[PDB]
Each structure stands twice: as structure tokens, then as C-alpha cells.
Design an enzyme around this catalytic site. Structure first.
Site, PDB file in Angstrom:
ATOM      1  N   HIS B 460       0.794  -1.175  -0.109  1.00  0.00           N
ATOM      2  CA  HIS B 460      -0.053  -0.043  -0.049  1.00  0.00           C
ATOM      3  C   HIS B 460       0.919   1.356  -0.093  1.00  0.00           C
ATOM      4  O   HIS B 460       1.883   1.218   0.693  1.00  0.00           O
ATOM      5  CB  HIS B 460      -0.913   0.150   1.418  1.00  0.00           C
ATOM      6  CG  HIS B 460      -1.788   0.908   1.458  1.00  0.00           C
ATOM      7  ND1 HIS B 460      -2.819   1.279   0.590  1.00  0.00           N
ATOM      8  CD2 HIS B 460      -1.866   2.075   2.393  1.00  0.00           C
ATOM      9  CE1 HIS B 460      -3.450   2.328   1.098  1.00  0.00           C
ATOM     10  NE2 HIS B 460      -2.934   2.796   1.908  1.00  0.00           N
TER      11      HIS B 460
HETATM   12  C1  LIG Z   1       5.125   9.329   7.199  1.00  0.00           C
HETATM   13  C2  LIG Z   1       4.589   7.985   6.948  1.00  0.00           C
HETATM   14  C3  LIG Z   1       4.444   7.378   5.693  1.00  0.00           C
HETATM   15  C4  LIG Z   1       3.930   6.272   5.729  1.00  0.00           C
HETATM   16  N1  LIG Z   1       3.893   5.581   4.153  1.00  0.00           N
HETATM   17  C5  LIG Z   1       3.347   4.067   4.323  1.00  0.00           C
HETATM   18  C6  LIG Z   1       3.443   3.742   3.043  1.00  0.00           C
HETATM   19  O1  LIG Z   1       3.837   4.257   2.117  1.00  0.00           O
HETATM   20  N2  LIG Z   1       2.829   2.065   3.254  1.00  0.00           N
HETATM   21  C7  LIG Z   1       2.663   1.536   3.958  1.00  0.00           C
HETATM   22  O2  LIG Z   1       1.978   0.627   3.796  1.00  0.00           O
HETATM   23  N3  LIG Z   1       2.688   2.202   5.299  1.00  0.00           N
HETATM   24  C8  LIG Z   1       3.153   3.478   5.526  1.00  0.00           C
HETATM   25  N4  LIG Z   1       3.251   4.074   6.625  1.00  0.00           N
HETATM   26  C9  LIG Z   1       2.819   3.214   7.893  1.00  0.00           C
HETATM   27  C10 LIG Z   1       1.449   3.256   8.405  1.00  0.00           C
HETATM   28  O3  LIG Z   1       0.960   4.601   8.519  1.00  0.00           O
HETATM   29  C11 LIG Z   1       1.199   2.855   9.787  1.00  0.00           C
HETATM   30  O4  LIG Z   1       2.064   1.521   9.784  1.00  0.00           O
HETATM   31  C12 LIG Z   1      -0.138   2.743   9.847  1.00  0.00           C
HETATM   32  O5  LIG Z   1      -0.980   3.905   9.642  1.00  0.00           O
HETATM   33  C13 LIG Z   1      -0.288   2.322  11.527  1.00  0.00           C
HETATM   34  O6  LIG Z   1      -1.217   1.364  11.721  1.00  0.00           O
HETATM   35  P1  LIG Z   1      -2.169   1.252  13.100  1.00  0.00           P
HETATM   36  O7  LIG Z   1      -3.086   0.265  13.225  1.00  0.00           O
HETATM   37  O8  LIG Z   1      -1.303   1.302  14.402  1.00  0.00           O
HETATM   38  O9  LIG Z   1      -2.847   2.836  13.005  1.00  0.00           O
HETATM   39  P2  LIG Z   1      -2.715   4.471  13.118  1.00  0.00           P
HETATM   40  O10 LIG Z   1      -3.134   4.926  12.242  1.00  0.00           O
HETATM   41  O11 LIG Z   1      -1.255   4.954  13.263  1.00  0.00           O
HETATM   42  O12 LIG Z   1      -3.124   4.869  14.830  1.00  0.00           O
HETATM   43  C14 LIG Z   1      -4.425   5.400  14.580  1.00  0.00           C
HETATM   44  C15 LIG Z   1      -4.795   6.478  15.513  1.00  0.00           C
HETATM   45  O13 LIG Z   1      -4.576   6.472  16.856  1.00  0.00           O
HETATM   46  C16 LIG Z   1      -4.912   7.876  17.390  1.00  0.00           C
HETATM   47  N5  LIG Z   1      -4.468   7.969  18.883  1.00  0.00           N
HETATM   48  C17 LIG Z   1      -3.276   8.319  19.285  1.00  0.00           C
HETATM   49  N6  LIG Z   1      -3.444   8.209  20.876  1.00  0.00           N
HETATM   50  C18 LIG Z   1      -4.935   8.268  20.793  1.00  0.00           C
HETATM   51  C19 LIG Z   1      -5.677   8.309  22.018  1.00  0.00           C
HETATM   52  N7  LIG Z   1      -5.094   7.660  23.278  1.00  0.00           N
HETATM   53  N8  LIG Z   1      -7.029   8.246  22.063  1.00  0.00           N
HETATM   54  C20 LIG Z   1      -7.599   8.038  20.689  1.00  0.00           C
HETATM   55  N9  LIG Z   1      -6.707   8.175  19.621  1.00  0.00           N
HETATM   56  C21 LIG Z   1      -5.537   7.952  19.663  1.00  0.00           C
HETATM   57  C22 LIG Z   1      -4.081   8.673  16.444  1.00  0.00           C
HETATM   58  O14 LIG Z   1      -4.817   9.755  16.387  1.00  0.00           O
HETATM   59  C23 LIG Z   1      -4.414   7.982  15.159  1.00  0.00           C
HETATM   60  O15 LIG Z   1      -5.327   8.388  14.283  1.00  0.00           O
HETATM   61  C24 LIG Z   1       3.564   5.287   6.665  1.00  0.00           C
HETATM   62  C25 LIG Z   1       4.106   5.950   7.843  1.00  0.00           C
HETATM   63  C26 LIG Z   1       4.175   7.185   8.084  1.00  0.00           C
HETATM   64  C27 LIG Z   1       4.440   7.930   9.483  1.00  0.00           C
END
Ligand SMILES: Cc1cc2nc3c(=O)[nH]c(=O)nc-3n(C[C@H](O)[C@H](O)[C@H](O)COP(=O)(O)OP(=O)(O)OC[C@H]3O[C@@H](n4cnc5c(N)ncnc54)[C@H](O)[C@@H]3O)c2cc1C
Ligand SMILES: Cc1cc2nc3c(=O)[nH]c(=O)nc-3n(C[C@H](O)[C@H](O)[C@H](O)COP(=O)(O)OP(=O)(O)OC[C@H]3O[C@@H](n4cnc5c(N)ncnc54)[C@H](O)[C@@H]3O)c2cc1C
Ligand SMILES: COC(=O)CN1C(C)=Nc2ccc(Br)cc2[C@@H]1c1ccccc1
Ligand SMILES: COC(=O)CN1C(C)=Nc2ccc(Br)cc2[C@@H]1c1ccccc1
Ligand SMILES: [Cl-]
Ligand SMILES: [Cl-]
Ligand SMILES: [Cl-]
Ligand SMILES: [Cl-]
Ligand code: NA
Ligand code: NA
Ligand code: NA
EC number: 1.8.1.12
Lengths: 488, 485
Positions: B460
Site C-alpha cells: 500500500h
Molecule cells: C510518514 C509515513 C508514511 C508512511 N507510508 C506508508 C506507506 O507508504 N505504505 C505503508 O504500508 N505504510 C506506510 N506508513 C505506515 C502506516 O502509516 C502505519 O503503519 C499505520 O498507519 C499504523 O497502523 P495502526 O493500526 O497502528 O494505526 P494508526 O493510524 O497509526 O493509529 C490510529 C490513530 O490512533 C490515534 N490515537 C493516538 N493516541 C490516541 C488516544 N489515546 N486516544 C484516541 N486516539 C489516539 C491517532 O490519532 C491515530 O489517528 C507510513 C507511516 C508514516 C508515518
């Protein structure tokens, strides 16, 4: 007195993993599900929001920005194919790129708001969630635990899916720095930028800034070790360096900021560990992402953390506390949108469905949207070699043809297949070049299917592509027998 | 006189592999014969074969250059600013550019001939004098000066194929793709006649390089272009070419062409419709190239269709004469000829019989936007299996929301055998499709199940990942009939 709102599942973080879980539980097990997140649309102050990191400040908007960048290459490269225009008239408008990326992200925010409103059993709550106790989740006004409680949420099961946040080293002047977060919102393109880190975000932002910088602008990336991209195939890391240098980005290896002070004109004076200095308009700290555990107040219920500091979880995403789970970046495995999506689905299968299931964390295909990009799946050779007695490597790297005509002769395509030479199982595929990320996907399926190199070569080429190169390698370029590189 | 282990007629995809593999991997002495050393008029094909000289390689480059039409415009959405009015599409520059690339491969192929021990190149026209004797005349005229007689233990027919020119009045006023690679200036008005890939690919090439008031029209005698390809994809590619200015005339066919005094062309269709154009390209098919081979001399049998008759192992009715590639008239593909030509050499100068496998062969149309495809189309699978399921996804990607090209739908479709979940066919439209499909080919060799696809974790963000995120069919074919049961 009166009842707290009651849920089968409360998920903290409305991001890549949490949203798949919340959705799967609501639409496929008929459950009532609460999802907490700290903003409903993207941007400062908290950058992440409804949709998560990937959506607001990650994969999605960066990919737009990398597409935005690729036009610098395109416009130059077209002369070779006969395109003529006024080269002096060409300017790269950041404001206008950001404003595009912005409302596109906003549509995704607004679109997921509407899907909560439309899905019975799925409700959103704006605020900061934490653990009051093992079945209570408090949603507070801010990250501060003394902020006013907003609502108490009774939950049978709790899903920690808060993700990760940029790691900011404690150095003098760290307040003078930014992170990937702020990069997405610079109001104008930095003229000199230094990205700190040799990892996928840094390499990526570098090309972005490279394309959109004004006038006599300069992009410097620095890395604490020899060779950027630790974890990737070693020919690719070298090739990609030479190609980043070629597009005029310069690489500082074996260098690491030690302090930053402000210059009287608001610019940035950076002193490295070695005594070296550098002046930039922006310093983008991108040296690692740390699981986001601090606002959760995990002490209240005693969820154990790994030494590295992520939420410790078993192959099923369960913590040392029943009914509390964690998935995604907060777990500190693979930090990828699809692994978090596949983690949440599996958890929800395991806990609400008939079919227990655990996330396969090996052979995950991934990309790097550098210019050109990497596409990879499986083990790199140096790891392969440690764990298998006989390992073969197959390699190919023409500079492709279109790029002979286009002017960018520096643009190689490397392709690498790493095999268990003892039966020919493909352990790993590693690619750099145009389309690399689009090509690697089915290789994923190939690996999950235990494809042998014979299966690769025996399949018939699609001509003319770069991918066909992968079905043309028949003779190993060299090997490793017990640990040691050889060649015959 | 000169004499050899293997004599190849046609220095093409199949034959040059055949050659090299026999000559280098087996130490055998080898002759290869072609009519020209480098690309272009008068014979177009030449050392390197069709694909190098007037086939995949040159069209790929020209299509790559067409795309910049799309590129230049879409750059605006991403905030690129430049003087739009100064934009010109320089055809001569591209043709000159394409000519050196092609010329260079020619030269280095001739470099491989002078470097390689026991593989020799012969200039002129090959013909079967006798089952052990190949004559090389000076021209196609079978009565011309002999240049060589070559004594040939084993013989290889790899003379490829040629554009079919329907015998309509004034056909002589039309060109094929051969001449198209060499036009001195880009047509203002062009008719491409045909529904297949060559017609489509050229349609889009002329579309980008057309001078200011220009227009590309394409005609097909039937209702939808691209018979053989997935139907959703045929319909889409049609809608998308229309949005990029190319007019599609379906249910129309030329009955004659007559020449105007100003050089242009008056095309009259069976329907009584007429259209004036600067060029008429004919890409209605490609036939076996067997006329000049003098086959009569030995009686190598051709089929009703006109391709040399061959078994699974490339063998002709005549012991020790064989035929691979387009001359045989099955899959007309460079990589197939290359596979055919090398299994041949292994089955003849070595251990193991090897038969080229013609099924489940991945291929591409480099249209704008491109198609990549592999395995069966749904209508064909609904006739061989009893429960067929069709998995479908057709979003317009975000980069194209921002770009201006809102019409640029990516289509991804998996055709399954619903009884066991075996994948039989994967059909793709959209940027990247030809690259995406390659590794799908391998999958289809390893017996991929629709679940082997959804269970793999996506990369992705990519279009490809859509192949890895379809679990519920969009519809089905039950024992013949389409439904959503
Ligand atoms: C700059 C960047 C570029 C990236 N590019 C890619 C890519 O091209 N391809 C790929 O596969 N991956 C990419 N990634 C990785 C991907 O974004 C992450 O791995 C994924 O989004 C995180 O998964 P998650 O389930 O932990 O959710 P996340 O989206 O990271 O976390 C979900 C939410 O938790 C919320 N949150 C935090 N604390 C609290 C609180 N306690 N109360 C309520 N909500 C809270 C945050 O606001 C956020 O909205 C990238 C990451 C970054 C930083
Ligand atoms: C416009 C166009 C685009 C194409 N694009 C693709 C594509 O993208 N991908 C793909 O896989 N395929 C493509 N093809 C088809 C591909 O080119 C052919 O399938 C392939 O070249 C067939 O190889 P072959 O070995 O049969 O012989 P060829 O490569 O056709 O070579 C035959 C050789 O025989 C020579 N010859 C003919 N008569 C004699 C004679 N009597 N004596 C001595 N020599 C003789 C010719 O000069 C020629 O060099 C394309 C074709 C065309 C026309
Ligand atoms: C049209 O289907 C959807 O768009 C719903 N979603 C699904 C199935 N999984 C998701 C995974 C990660 C993210 Br980020 C977003 C989704 C969306 C979604 C939208 C609204 C609420 C929960 C999940
Ligand atoms: C540069 O590639 C080579 O090493 C030699 N070739 C091989 C192995 N296969 C071919 C298949 C089709 C064509 Br068209 C060309 C080749 C070339 C080649 C070049 C010159 C003479 C024989 C084979
Ligand atoms: Cl700007
Ligand atoms: Cl670092
Ligand atoms: Cl021109
Ligand atoms: Cl037709
Ligand atoms: Na709801
Ligand atoms: Na192959
Ligand atoms: Na998946």
C-alpha cells in the site's frame, strides 16, 4: 445516577488497524463498537485523526506528494521522446500541491465520518482515550489525565490501536526541528532541508523536497551509519544512494546531529557529532517511530511493555491482561498499514468469529516510494545465508532502454531473487526501478505459494516489461555456503 | 559450399535463441539467415527479428513517448506550472531517437555474431532447395542469383509473420505498422483499421503526436474492439480512449480507398460512409510468412489457416525440419517464440524432450492506459467449468482525482473456478498493468486459489493490492448462465 454507554468492543485509535477491527466486528459479528480518536479530520495540532496515520499523514498523502515529485523527472525525460516546450517557464508550486493533497485527505476523513453515521453498531468518539480500568475506557478532553472526562465507556473487550509517533532524540535544540507530521504542512517549500534518518520516510521526503525546492535549493539527507536503508537488499541500498545523488540530493553517512541552534535570520544551524556543521531552513527528524503508549495510562491495569517499549502481545495480539488487545504500530512488529489491517481482522476473527487466526509476519511485501522506487518481499541475502546451508542469489541490472533515450542513464533496474539452493525455494525478491512496487505484489502470492526459482524461470515473459527479467534468471550470480559468500 | 549442424531461416526471436542455445550450450555449428542486417525499409524486419526492428521494442518506446501527452497535462494538478501554449510533440525527434536504439541492438547482435565461435550470419533469402540444403538467394525471387547453398543436418523455419492486407480496391494506398514506424511526419488525420492490439497501440501513439487540428479514427468491423480480451476491459478501454480524443468507429469496414490529388486518402466503408484521412494503417491481422520459403520443394504441410503444421515439439511432417514462432500461427508473442526455440534445441541436442506450454501465458496491450492479462476470459471459462466466479474492482484512483483524468478507472478482475477456488484468469487495465501481471503468471503456474490471493498482505499504496483484497464474487456463471447467486 445513570448508565455509561456499553460496548462489546472499544477501540482506541481510528486508524489502519482499529478501523478494520471496529468495522469487522460491527458489520460481520453484529457487535456494538466504540472507536475513539483525537480529531475527525487531518492536520495540526495532532496530525493523525479519523482514518489514522496512513490516511492523514502517511502512505496516502506522501504517495500523492511522490507523484507530485515525479513530474520533475517526467518533464526532463520527455525531451528524449521529442517533447518541446519552454523549460525556462517551469515552476513547482508547493502551496498548490499541499492544497490538493489536503482536500483529498479531507474527503477521506469526511467519507469515513459518513460511514460511521451510516453503520448501525459503529460509533465514533472524539477525544483522548485511556484505561481507567480493565473494562472501563475514559475519553478525556486532552492527553493530560487531569483534563475533563468527556464520557466513560464500558467495554467487554478493549483494542489498543494508537499506532506510533516520531522519535525525537534529546539533543540541545530539538525544539528547532520538525517531523514527518509538520512536513506535510510547511506553508512554503524549504530551500535547504536536512532530513535526519536513512529510513523509508527520510529517503522519501528527500525526493519530495528535491522536486519542489525553489532557486539554488539543496536537499541533504543524513544517516548515523555507512549505508542508508538498513534492512533492504544491499545492492539496492547502494544503487539507491547513487541514484539519489544523481537527482542532486546529497547523502551524509556516518554523521549524526548533536545539536541545533537558531540563526538570527530564523534558519537552522546544525552541528553533528563529528564537529561538522550545516545550515538549512528546515530540519526534518525522521530517525525512527516509537509505539505511542504514554497517553493510555496502561499502569492503571498493568499491561506489560516490551523492553523496546511496545505493547507486548502474543501471536494473537493479546496482552497479559485478558480482554485487552493490541495491534498495529503500537505492537512494534512491522510498521505497515496492511499488517495492521490484517492484524485487526484476525483479532476480530479470533475473538468474535468462529475462526481463530493469526497474522503471518513473514514474506510481507513492501515498498519505498523513492525515485525510482524499491519493491521487496522476503529475506535479504545476509539473513538468508545465516539460516540456510546453501543459498543462491540471481541478479540482473541493465540500465533499461527507455532511460537510454530519456536522458536518465543513471536509472538502473536491479532485480534479485534469493533462493534456498538446496531445493530452490524462493526466500526473497528485491527490486529497484520504475514499477518495482507494482511488480512485487504478485511475488507476495508466489512466496505464500512456496514458489521455486524453477517456477519463476519456467513462467513465460511478458515483453517488453522490467518484470519479465524475473522469469529470465536461470543461472545463479553467486552463492553462500555455510555462512560464506562464494561464487562457483 | 558450406555445411552445419543447424541452419536457421530467420534471425528472429525464436531463431536467434535456437541458434545461440545450440551454438553455445551444445558446441554445435550454426547458420542463421536474414534479408537485412539492420532495421528499416525495404524489408523492415531484419537481424533481430520483428520484435526488435518493427515490433515490441520500437512501439514500446513510441508509446512511452505518447504517454507524455497525458503526463504533461496531469502535472498541473500537482502544481507544476509551465507555458502550455509552447508545448509541441516532435515526431521526427522520436523517430530519430527510436532509430538509434533499434540500430544499436542490430549492431550488437552483429557484434555477437563476429564474437561467437560456430554461429555464422548470412545475408539474403532463405529457401528449402532440399531436405538438407538451404539456398540463400539474393532476393525473394526464387529465380535470382544463388549466394550460398548451406548443407543442413537439421533445419529451422522461423521467418515470422507479416501484415494481412485485405484485397480491397486501392489497398495499395494503405500502410501497415511497418511503414508507420518510418512516417516522415505525423499524420494530421489517421484511420487505424483493426480491433487488435497493434491498431489500438498505434491509435494512441498517433493521438499524442498529432499536429494541432488533428484526429485519430479507429475502425473495427464488429461491435467492440479487442475480441479475446476481458469484456469489461474492452468496454472501458474504449470509453477511455474516447475521452482522450480518439474516435472509435465500430460496425464499420473499408470497402475501398482511393487517392486524392493532394496525397490524402478517401476511405469508403461497406455502410456507404466515407472519411478522408492522411494515412490509412492496416492492422487487421498477421499471417504466416511462408510464400518465399519454397516449401513446395519438400512439401512441408501448412494448415487451412496458412501456418506451417507442427506437433507439441515444433516438428514438421518432414523429418528434421521444424518450425517455431509466428510462422506456426499459435500465440504470436516474442517470449513464446523464445521458449519454443529453446525447448526445440533441448529436445534435439540433448537429454530431455521439452514442450513449450501455450496456456496461461501472461501478455499486455500497451494502450493508453495499458492492459495486462493472463489466463481465461470469463465467457470462455463459463463453457469449461460449471461454477465460475468473477471477482471485480473498478475505482478511479486518487492520483487521478487530483490529476484531471477522472476517467482513468483501474479495472481488476479475477475469474475463478468456484468449486475449488482455483484462479483461471486475471485481467487488468490501468497504469502498471503489464508490470503487475508478470508475477501473476507464475502464480497461475503454482495453482493459485482465490484465497491464496486475499490471504497475501497488500503493498500500500499500489493498484496491484486490489488483487489481494477481493474475497466476495461480484457475480457468477452457473453452468453457462450469468447470475449473482
Ligand atoms: C510518514 C509515513 C508514511 C508512511 N507510508 C506508508 C506507506 O507508504 N505504505 C505503508 O504500508 N505504510 C506506510 N506508513 C505506515 C502506516 O502509516 C502505519 O503503519 C499505520 O498507519 C499504523 O497502523 P495502526 O493500526 O497502528 O494505526 P494508526 O493510524 O497509526 O493509529 C490510529 C490513530 O490512533 C490515534 N490515537 C493516538 N493516541 C490516541 C488516544 N489515546 N486516544 C484516541 N486516539 C489516539 C491517532 O490519532 C491515530 O489517528 C507510513 C507511516 C508514516 C508515518
Ligand atoms: C507492431 C508490433 C508490435 C508487437 N509487440 C509485441 C509485444 O509487445 N510483445 C510481444 O511479445 N510480441 C509483440 N509483437 C510480436 C512479436 O514481434 C513476434 O511474435 C515475434 O517477433 C515473433 O518472433 P519469430 O521468431 O516468429 O520471428 P521474427 O522475430 O518475426 O523474425 C523472423 C525473421 O525472419 C526473417 N525472414 C523472413 N523471411 C526470410 C527468408 N525467406 N530468409 C531469411 N530470413 C527471412 C525476417 O526478416 C525476420 O527477421 C509485436 C508485433 C508487431 C508487428
Ligand atoms: C467501503 O468499505 C470501507 O471503506 C470501510 N472500511 C473498511 C472495510 N476497513 C478500513 C480499514 C482501515 C481504514 Br483507515 C478504513 C477502513 C474503512 C472504514 C471506514 C469507516 C469506519 C471503519 C472502517
Ligand atoms: C544479449 O543476449 C544474449 O546473450 C544473446 N541472445 C540470446 C541468448 N537470445 C536471443 C533471443 C532472441 C533475440 Br531477437 C536475440 C537473442 C540474443 C542473440 C543475439 C545475437 C545472436 C544470437 C542470439
Ligand atoms: Cl510555491
Ligand atoms: Cl539517523
Ligand atoms: Cl514533427
Ligand atoms: Cl476490422
Ligand atoms: Na453508527
Ligand atoms: Na521464462
Ligand atoms: Na490481504
Amino acid at each position: 445516577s445513570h448508565m455509561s454507554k456499553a460496548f462489546d468492543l472499544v477501540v482506541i485509535g481510528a486508524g489502519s488497524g482499529g478501523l478494520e477491527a471496529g468495522w469487522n466486528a460491527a458489520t460481520l459479528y453484529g457487535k456494538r463498537v466504540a472507536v475513539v480518536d483525537v480529531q475527525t479530520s487531518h492536520g495540526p495540532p495532532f496530525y493523525a485523526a479519523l482514518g489514522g496515520t496512513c490516511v492523514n499523514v502517511g502512505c496516502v498523502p506522501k504517495k500523492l506528494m511522490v507523484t507530485g515529485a515525479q513530474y520533475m523527472d517526467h518533464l526532463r525525460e520527455s525531451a528524449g521522446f521529442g517533447w518541446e516546450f519552454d523549460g525556462s517557464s517551469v515552476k513547482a508550486n508547493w502551496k498548490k500541491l499541499i492544497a490538493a493533497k489536503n482536500e483529498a485527505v479531507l474527503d477521506i476523513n469526511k467519507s469515513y465520518e459518513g460511514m460511521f453515521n451510516d453503520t448501525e453498531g459503529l460509533d465514533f468518539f472524539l477525544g483522548w482515550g485511556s484505561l481507567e480500568s480493565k473494562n472501563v475506557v475514559v475519553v478525556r478532553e486532552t492527553a493530560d489525565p487531569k483534563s475533563a472526562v468527556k464520557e466513560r465507556l464500558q467495554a467487554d473487550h478493549i483494542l489498543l490501536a494508537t499506532g506510533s509517533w516520531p522519535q525525537m532524540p534529546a539533543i540541545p535544540g530539538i525544539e528547532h526541528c520538525i517531523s514527518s507530521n509538520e512536513a506535510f504542512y510547511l506553508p512554503e517549500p524549504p530551500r535547504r532541508v536536512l532530513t535526519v534518518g536513512g529510513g523509508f520516510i527520510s529517503v522519501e521526503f528527500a525526493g519530495i523536497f528535491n522536486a519542489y525546492k525553489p532557486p539554488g535549493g539543496k536537499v541533504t539527507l543524513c544517516y548515523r551509519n555507512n549505508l542508508i536503508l538498513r534492512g533492504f537488499d544491499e545492492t539496492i541500498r547502494e544503487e539507491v544512494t547513487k541514484q539519489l545523488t544523481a537527482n542532486g540530493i546529497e547523502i551524509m553517512t556516518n554523521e549524526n546531529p548533536a545539536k541545533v541552534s537558531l540563526n538570527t535570520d530564523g534558519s537552522k544551524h546544525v552541528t553533528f557529532e563529528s564537529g561538522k556543521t550545516l545550515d538549512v531552513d528546515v530540519v526534518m527528524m525522521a530517525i525512527g517511530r516509537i509505539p505511542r503508549t504514554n497517553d493510555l495510562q496502561l499502569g492503571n491495569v498493568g499491561v506489560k511493555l516490551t523492553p523496546k517499549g511496545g505493547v507486548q502481545v502474543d501471536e494473537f495480539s493479546r496482552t497479559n491482561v485478558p480482554n485487552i488487545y493490541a495491534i498495529g504500530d503500537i505492537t512494534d512488529r512491522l510498521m505497515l498499514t496492511p499488517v495492521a489491517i490484517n492484524e485487526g481482522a484476525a483479532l476480530v476473527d479470533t475473538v468474535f468469529g468462529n475462526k481463530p487466526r493469526k497474522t503471518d509476519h513473514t514474506r510481507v511485501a513492501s515498498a519505498v516510494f523513492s525515485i525510482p522506487p524499491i519493491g521487496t518481499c522476503g529475506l535479504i541475502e545476509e539473513v538468508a545465508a545465516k539460516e540456510f546451508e546453501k543459498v543462491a542469489v540471481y541478479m540482473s541490472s541493465f540500465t533499461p532502454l527507455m532511460h537510454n533515450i530519456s536522458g536518465s542513464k543513471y536509472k538502473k533496474f536491479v532485480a534479485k531473487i534469493v533462493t534456498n539452493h538446496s531445493d530452490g525455494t524462493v526466500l526473497g525478491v528485491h527490486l529497484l526501478g520504475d514499477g518495482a512496487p507494482e511488480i512485487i505484489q504478485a511475488v507476495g502470492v508466489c512466496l505464500r505459494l512456496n514458489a521455486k526459482i524453477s517456477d519463476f524461470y519456467n513462467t513465460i515473459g511478458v515483453h517488453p516489461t522490467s518484470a519479465e527479467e524475473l522469469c529470465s534468471m536461470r543461472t545463479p550470480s553467486y552463492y553462500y555456503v555455510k555462512g560464506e559468500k562464494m561464487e562457483k
